């Protein structure tokens, strides 16, 4: 609560929290601590953050009044099977299946983790058993919007009649997929929070990678190469078949099933068949059973038809899920998604190429950074901004000019409104424009309206979809670009993470304004003010020239606002107490005459600035017009700071009147001089004891 918490957390992240190595600990639970504790008291873990109650299953649909979750007992593996194995060796096939209450998509993502030992060990720590130090607690790592969170769970599983209701191995004595699922259910809040979920969602949540999906009845004319660069990049490619209104036909020499069964693409090679050149795609059934006439159709015995054993011996080598159908496969298989793993995914094994990664993080806030689409140029230029830099382009021989490929994924974080996954999603997109030159805005300037106004995009966002992550694989020539992430319509609060997978290095910065402050150099005096304020002011001061903050108020109200209260007339006392603190360099609480004319003048330089913006004797300023009002006021700031100003002085109608605009500028000018003075050597930081912090923290 409060930024000292988030700043503190931002420091930790910067030091390494949220990283696979230092996964964030969900609900402050400590797997070792909790296990150790139970290890000691000779007992079993009963998770206090995820009771074996109905609320874990759901909210009356898989909830507490409903039959589905009635009379079912939470049994641990201890009771379920004889030799409860968590996991087992190499494990050829995969016999994982849903229960009468699980979800189809679930088995797809979970099963996809069995394709790689290295990539499963990342979500599910292998250092776990029911033999040595059981205690009944397991842990898992889930990637949550750019970060890893470690989750703890007790092995209690929902069973009705005595069988697992959710995911489980049909044969075995293994229960890591059962508990991997309960764990993912817990971090989503409800087991029923998993419904509505998408395997692309689980892939990334179980990977850290970026899953790009493609509709197969209208794929890219470069999908084969796409499939090839991924396969040699250890990417987890997954294709599926659609079930459209009882769709279960053959369609061509293609069998007879049109079942929505998830398959994987482990191979893709282009081969010369009698001089024709056949692009083949090797599919693999994650569960094993083959069932596909031919071996590779099209007059099938094409493994002898001008295809030497010098490549025939390569094919049909493996075991389990052995297909190899022609790319013309497009007949069947309605879909394909590949999780393009991140750099560290592979235990540095030189085995597969690696993607280059550079994720960021941002916010959209109403009245400041919630810019909106390129559709709304008034506010658009107010969304956070970034810099993509491309220099080294791709490698293959020749294919469609350009060079540098970058897969951009923009993802939106959760916000107490999405009861499930897939719901209450903001419509998100992003726009790419190329840096026309700017060495100034190279990273230390925030592009205004004018730039996106005189600048077209290029390929940018293809449409603002309404889902968790919006993708966009590009390939623009070696240069410098600006990504502007946003929703469609303005004023839609939300957090996000914008990552980048490029086949080659790519300098990605966060283009925004530095915290700058530069205005008056009000060198004091007594003379030259011209005996003007001198006369009538000294008259207002009881004796010498001192005027307290409570005096400043009544005095300043006689001047401005003409005296009719409504829409804050004059200056609130907090404002006045602020206007005093900004000039009272002793602690008198009253203002002299020099450090009074200062206030009088700097204030005059605020009315002009407020009305030069608010063209209308309404005494009301909009929010978005602050970045620019603080501009002609001497101060600049990064997006965070603009966000707090609006979140502190703006109305619910996103309005900041003159009074709050003045305390804001005075409160703000004061802290700059405090830090700047505490930091003469310009080290960039200041030291302070609690007392010091207290003297200062109270304005």
């Amino acid at each position: 609560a409060g930024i000292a918490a988030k700043l503190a957390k931002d420091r930790e992240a910067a030091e390494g929290l949220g990283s696979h190595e230092r996964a964030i600990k969900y609900l402050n639970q400590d797997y070792e601590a909790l296990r150790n504790e139970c290890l000691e008291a000779g007992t079993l873990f009963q998770d206090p953050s995820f009771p074996a109650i109905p609320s874990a299953l759901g909210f009356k649909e898989l909830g507490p009044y409903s039959s589905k979750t009635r009379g079912m007992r939470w049994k641990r593996p201890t009771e379920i099977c004889a030799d409860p194995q968590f996991i087992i060796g190499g494990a050829t096939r995969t016999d994982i299946c849903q229960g009468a209450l699980g979800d189809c998509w679930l088995l797809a993502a979970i099963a996809s983790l069995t394709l790689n030992e290295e990539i499963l060990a990342r979500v599910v720590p292998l250092n776990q058993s029911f033999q040595e130090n059981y205690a009944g607690i397991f842990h898992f790592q889930f990637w949550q919007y750019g970060e890893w969170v470690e989750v703890v769970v007790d092995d209690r599983l929902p069973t009705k009649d005595g069988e697992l209701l959710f995911v489980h191995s049909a044969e075995g004595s293994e229960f890591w997929s059962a508990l991997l699922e309960k764990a993912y259910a817990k971090i989503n809040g409800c087991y029923e929070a998993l419904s509505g979920g998408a395997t692309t969602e689980g892939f990334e949540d179980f990977t850290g990678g970026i899953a790009e999906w493609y509709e197969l009845k209208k794929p890219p004319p470069n999908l084969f190469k796409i499939i090839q660069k991924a396969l040699q990049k250890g990417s987890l490619l997954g294709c599926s078949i659609d079930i459209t209104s009882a769709a279960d036909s053959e369609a061509i020499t293609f069998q007879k099933l049109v079942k929505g069964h998830a398959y994987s693409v482990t191979g893709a090679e282009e081969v010369e068949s009698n001089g024709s050149l056949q692009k083949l795609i090797r599919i693999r059934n994650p569960w094993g059973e083959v069932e596909w006439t031919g071996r590779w159709n099209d007059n099938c015995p094409s493994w002898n038809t001008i295809d030497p054993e010098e490549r025939e011996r390569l094919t049909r080598r493996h075991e389990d899920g052995e297909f190899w159908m022609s790319f013309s496969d497009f007949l069947r298989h309605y879909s394909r998604l590949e999780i393009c793993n991140l750099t560290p995914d592979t235990l540095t094994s030189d085995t597969y190429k690696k993607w280059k990664l550079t994720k960021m993080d941002g916010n959209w806030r109403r009245g400041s950074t919630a810019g909106g689409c390129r559709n709304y140029p008034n506010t658009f230029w107010m969304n956070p901004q970034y810099l993509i830099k491309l220099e080294e382009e791709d490698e293959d021989e020749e294919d469609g000019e350009s060079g540098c490929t970058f897969l951009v994924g923009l993802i939106q974080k959760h916000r107490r409104r999405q009861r499930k996954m897939g719901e209450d999603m903001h419509t998100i997109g992003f726009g790419i424009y190329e840096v026309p030159e700017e060495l100034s805005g190279q990273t230390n300037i925030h592009l205004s309206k004018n730039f996106f106004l005189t600048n077209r995009a290029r390929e940018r966002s293809d449409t603002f979809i309404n889902l968790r992550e919006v993708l966009n694989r590009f390939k623009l020539p070696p240069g410098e670009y600006i990504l502007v992430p946003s929703t469609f319509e303005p004023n839609k609060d939300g957090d996000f993470c914008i990552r980048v997978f490029s086949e080659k290095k790519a300098d990605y910065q966060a283009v925004d304004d530095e915290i700058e402050a530069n205005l008056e150099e009000f060198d004091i005096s007594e003379d030259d003010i011209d005996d003007g304020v001198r006369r009538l002011f000294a008259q207002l001061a009881g004796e010498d020239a001192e005027i307290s903050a409570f005096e400043l108020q009544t005095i300043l109200r006689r001047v401005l606002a003409k005296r009719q209260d409504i829409k804050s007339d004059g200056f609130s006392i907090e404002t006045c107490k602020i206007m005093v603190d900004m000039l009272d360099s002793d602690g008198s609480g009253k203002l002299g005459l020099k450090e009074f004319y200062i206030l009088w003048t700097k204030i005059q330089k605020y009315q002009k600035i407020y009305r030069e913006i608010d063209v209308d004797r309404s005494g009301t300023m909009n929010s978005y017009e602050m970045r620019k009002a603080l501009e002609e006021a001497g101060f600049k700031m990064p997006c965070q700071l603009h966000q707090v100003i609006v979140a502190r002085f703006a109305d619910d109608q996103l309005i900041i009147d003159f009074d709050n605009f003045v305390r804001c500028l005075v409160r703000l000018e004061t802290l700059f001089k405090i830090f700047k003075q505490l930091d003469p050597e310009n080290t960039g930081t200041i030291e302070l004891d609690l007392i010091s912090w207290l003297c200062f923290s109270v304005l």
Binding site: G2, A4, L7, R416, E687, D689, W693, S697
Partner: protein, 184 residues
Amino acid sequence: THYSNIEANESEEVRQFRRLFAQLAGDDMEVSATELMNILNKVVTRHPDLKTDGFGIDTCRSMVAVMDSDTTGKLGFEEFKYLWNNIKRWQAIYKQFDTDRSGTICSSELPGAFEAAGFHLNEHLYNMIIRRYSDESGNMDFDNFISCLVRLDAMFRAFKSLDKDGTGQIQVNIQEWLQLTMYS
């Protein structure tokens, strides 16, 4: 779907707050500075034994900002319970030092109160809180009293958060400095 978050150990007050929260935000269960204001200016204003005119907008804003971690300008539901607990608590101490109901507390009477509210400030902090919060005379009404104490306690928590190792000291760049001081 229908509002969840069930404790079974509800309370009278709170749940009416909770019902108000949903009637204005619902599943969001978040309130703004003005919405909050209204929500506090009833369970604090309705008592014929507490002399106050309610919380000022700036007070609620400080109430919203200090409990708001993402800078969305909205007070959470759970963050409200922390605060209101503290409020229903400082109201208590307030009337102890204002037992002659006047809508404020005697100047040199305030120290006992701060020493009582669980805050024993040093020379200057007391000076800081008076300058900043004492009204004209140098007295203090319930509004500043609560606000001061909300902002005070939160600046203890803030420090302790940025001082994990425990050096009784803290270093901040200008970004942080400004966020900490502008969002309070």
